[PDB]
Amino acid sequence: QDVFVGSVEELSAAHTLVMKINATDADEPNTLNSKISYRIVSLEPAYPPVFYLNKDTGEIYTTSVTLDREEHSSYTLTVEARDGNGEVTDKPVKQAQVQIRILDVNDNIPV
Amino acid sequence: DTGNLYCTRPVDREQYESFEIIAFATTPDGYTPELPLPLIIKIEDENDNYPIFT
């Protein structure tokens, strides 16, 4: 996908799955020619750290944080995918968007 | 806001003799106004293996 999309409710826990992402390779499955490694290479907002990407299983989790609509609602991430033993080229490669929104719940009673 | 380093749980000298941590300062607009300082946390030893007969 160009734009992967995700969301959760308020105070969804720390170190908890938010969403997953995927890429495909044209070399034979279950080999070094096709093992897919995943990283984040831009965040918005870039402080504090809010999430994590697993290199092998391609999942995105929150970090030690609970997220609230009422504190901040909308995040954007730029990811990259490459294969082989982790020797980066000098040539440019494609990257992907991930967008993640914190949903409002009625946690707050009207005063 | 202060740079106080902490360790988070106990650790065994048995298997760990040093970790290789790096400290870097940043602003809230992403600007980097200090060079990274690598610091080696050395682990230190106490008599905690028993002696055992052969």
CB neighbours of residue B38 within 10 Å: 9
Q: How far is A105 from chain B (nearest CA, A)?
A: 29
Name the residue among A98, A102, A43 with its Cα closest to residue A67: A102
- Tell me the one-letter amino acid at A30: N
Q: Using what technique was this structure determined?
A: cryo-EM
d(CA A75, CA A4): 12
The resolution in Å comes to 26.0
Is the distance from CB of A59 to CB of A20 less than 8 angstroms?
yes
How do beta strands B37-42 and A37-44 pair? unpaired
A53 phi and psi angles, rounded to 5 deg: -110, 125
Name the residue among A9, A14, A19 with its Cα closest to residue A64: A14
Q: How far is B24 from chain A (nearest CA, A)?
A: 14
Chain A residues inside the 8 Å CB shell of B28: 47
CA torsion sign for A64, A66, A72, A77 is positive
